[PDB]
Every structure is written in C-alpha cells, then in structure tokens.
C-alpha cells in the first residue's frame, strides 16, 4: 500500500500542484474522496485542524495546508533547492505564487461575473515578476529557480494552466513563461498524467467556474 | 548582514524583528516613509511591488514568510527534523491565515465587522490551544521542545488580537500562558519593552 494518501473534494483545486509533483517523481499515493454529503454531515471537518481539506498523510504523520504539504514534499525528495540560497528563493516564488491564487479563489468563488474583466486586465502586472525571476535564471532555459525541479515549480506550473484557461492567450506577451510552460508540460510522467482521466474528468473548481 | 526595509509600522515585520532580537542578532532598519514609496522608484524595484524587503549579505529576499523560514533554517529555529519542520510550517501557514484575516478587518471594514470578528475569534484560537496540548501538554514551544519561527510568528498574532480584544486568551489557559512563557525571554522581553518595539504603530491606519 502506499505511504502517502490525499484527502480532498472531487476538484483539483489546492491539489492539483502536489498530485502533479507526485505523478512527475513517480510516486504512489492514494486518494480519498470526498463528497460534498460527506463533509456536509460535518464529523471529518471537526476533526481537521482548521476544519478544512486538503489533508494529507505520510505513513502517520498527518499534514493540513497545502503549501505545507509542498514544502514537506519539496524537503524529502529534494526539490527544495540546492543550498539555503536556493530554498529561500523557491520559498519567495512559492509565496508569490500562492499570492496569486488567492486572489485568483476569491475571484471564481466570490465575483467572477462582475470582477472578471478588471482580474484579466490586471494580469500582465501580476506575471511579469515571474518572467523577470525566470530571465534571470540562465536566461528562463530551465527551471523557476537553479538547474533542478523544486516545488514550486509545480505550483506555478499550476498556476499558469489554470490562468490559460480563465484568460486564453495571457502568456502571449510572456516569451519565457510560454516557453516554461511548453517544457515542463512535455516532461514524460507529467504529460502522461496532464493527459489522464484522473487529471482531466476533474473539474478546476468546486463551483464549476473556471 | 541583515537589513529589513519597512514601513514605520510593526505590521509584518514585529514577528522577524522579535526573532533577531532574541536571538542576539544585529539589523540595521531602513525606513521607508510613505512620501518615499508614493515617488514610485523602490516600488517598481521590489519583486511583487511591495515590502518587506530583506538583505543578508547579497542576497535580496521578499515576502514575511519567505524571510521568517529563511532566518528559520540558517539560525536553526525549525525544527530538530523533518517531521517537525512540517508541523512547524503547518503552524505558520494557520497563522498567516488568521492575520490575513485581521488585516482585512483593520484595513478593509474596521467598524462594521469588528463585533463579528471578535464572535468568531475563540474558533480561530482554537486550534492553536489544540497543538499546544498535543506537546508536552503546551509546556514548551508550539512544535517539539525548542523555539521555532512559528512561535515568534504565533506570538505577534496573538499579542496583537489581546490589543484588539482585550481578554480573549482567558478561555485558553495554554495559549495565557504560552505568551507570559515566551514574552519574559530575556532579549524578548528586553526587546517587547524598547522604544524601538513600543513606539511604533502595529498598523499604517492607526486602527489596532
Ligand atoms: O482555496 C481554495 O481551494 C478554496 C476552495 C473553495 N471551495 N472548494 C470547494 C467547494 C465545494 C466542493 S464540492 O465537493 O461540494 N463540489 C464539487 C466537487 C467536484 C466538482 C464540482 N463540485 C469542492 C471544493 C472555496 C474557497 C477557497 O478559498
Ligand atoms: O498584509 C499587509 O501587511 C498589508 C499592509 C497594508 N498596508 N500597510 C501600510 C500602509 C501605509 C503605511 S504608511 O507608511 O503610509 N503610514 C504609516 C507609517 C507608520 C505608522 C502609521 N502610518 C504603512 C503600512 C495594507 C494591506 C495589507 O494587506
Ligand atoms: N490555507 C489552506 C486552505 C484550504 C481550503 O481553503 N480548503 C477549502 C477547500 S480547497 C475547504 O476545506 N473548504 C471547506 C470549508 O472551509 O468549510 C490551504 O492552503 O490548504
Ligand atoms: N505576501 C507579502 C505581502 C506584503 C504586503 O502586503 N506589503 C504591504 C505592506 S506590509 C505593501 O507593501 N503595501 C504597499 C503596496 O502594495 O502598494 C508578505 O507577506 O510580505
């Protein structure tokens, strides 16, 4: 059996970046869904530590947050970075990214009709740090930080897909970030899971906006 | 060679600021007063258009959490091993999340959801006052028997809300006494009462 289980709703949501890092690194995991009913009867939210999902176990060690779960990944595979310098700059893209997913939520579940326009105008302003990140870092040719994968470039990988989808076209202005985007999406284990039912019958939000 | 480069506030930087302090560390603090970041040059030059910036030697760090765990893994405060540094982090992620929270109540609608807020505080506390007990009984730190980042950072959030609702620790007796514990630290302490702590504001629009 395997050592590590994923519990979350029917989405991708908050998981899709670690379901990716573990299918890229060839890691099994289990997954235990979680239906709306089942939630609603309100017993599994009482017993997570600030009454929410995604939860996530490793033999017995128990984990909540999703940026959590990322980093401990990040920490026992090695995709944290070849020294401090490193990491402290996968920790700087990771925030950013998780900045703007944040404000990406609020917007699909709080105004996507009335704020839609205004996000997608916004945008540029809010990619251009991570093409500035990436032309910094031998020339935008390999990954968000240093020579190998870290964690979080899964999670703007993530980030970036879920963004062509709301505005088609956004990373057209952004030569590296389109370029990013086209390698990591090509790398063998993620395009055959990128490609799978597992990944693609999933819906990107709980409320069916996108 | 740290430099933190701020507002003239507490806000984000009070958690890494009490770190250093106790820790026995020297910064130097360069602020940025609001006619300097309004002229718009520091601004555009900061990664995500905003502050804290933070220097140690050459290298140039942004976002609170990024410098909290960067001081966190170089100075040792993160946990003897890995399965602690995942809890240290799952602390600090809750704890993020509540100030998020805060702010949003300080700077978007103070007057209006103050009482709903401070209704619901005792739910958000309440999962803090959980870990504590799963350790040691909440004799000692938040995660494992040694100071972590987490712990300045859980510190700040709640010294803070005691100043915005006075008295709503006394329902949690690990969370009371977690903060008279760590706030009679020698530096800490030393730190809490200096006019470089004391005479700032803990927020940019004067509500608290
Ligand atoms: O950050 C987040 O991930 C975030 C997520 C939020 N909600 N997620 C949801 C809400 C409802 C569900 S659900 O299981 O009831 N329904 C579903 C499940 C699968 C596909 C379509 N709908 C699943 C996920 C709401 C606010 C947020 O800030
Ligand atoms: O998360 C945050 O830190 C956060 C911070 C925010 N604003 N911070 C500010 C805003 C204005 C200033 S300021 O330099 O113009 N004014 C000041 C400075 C010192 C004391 C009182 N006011 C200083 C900090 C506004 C929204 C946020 O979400
Ligand atoms: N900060 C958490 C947020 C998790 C979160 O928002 N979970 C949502 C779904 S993705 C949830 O559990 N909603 C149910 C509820 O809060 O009632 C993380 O990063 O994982
Ligand atoms: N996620 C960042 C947020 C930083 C932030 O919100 N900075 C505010 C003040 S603390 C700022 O620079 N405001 C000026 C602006 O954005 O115009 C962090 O944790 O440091």
Redesign the pocket.
Known sequence: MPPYTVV??P?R??CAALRMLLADQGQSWKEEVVTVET?QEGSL?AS?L?????KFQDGDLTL????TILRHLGRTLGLYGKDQQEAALVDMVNDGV?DLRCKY?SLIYTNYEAGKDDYVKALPGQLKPFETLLSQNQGGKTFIVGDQISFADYNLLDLLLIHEVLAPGCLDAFPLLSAYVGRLSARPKLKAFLASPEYVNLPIN?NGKQ
């Not at 600030?50 to 995604?54: H, N, T």
């Not at 909540?64 to 940026?67: H, I, L, V, W």
């Open positions: 979350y709703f989405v949501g908050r939630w939210k997570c600030y009454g929410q999902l995604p909540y947050q999703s940026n998780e939520i709980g």
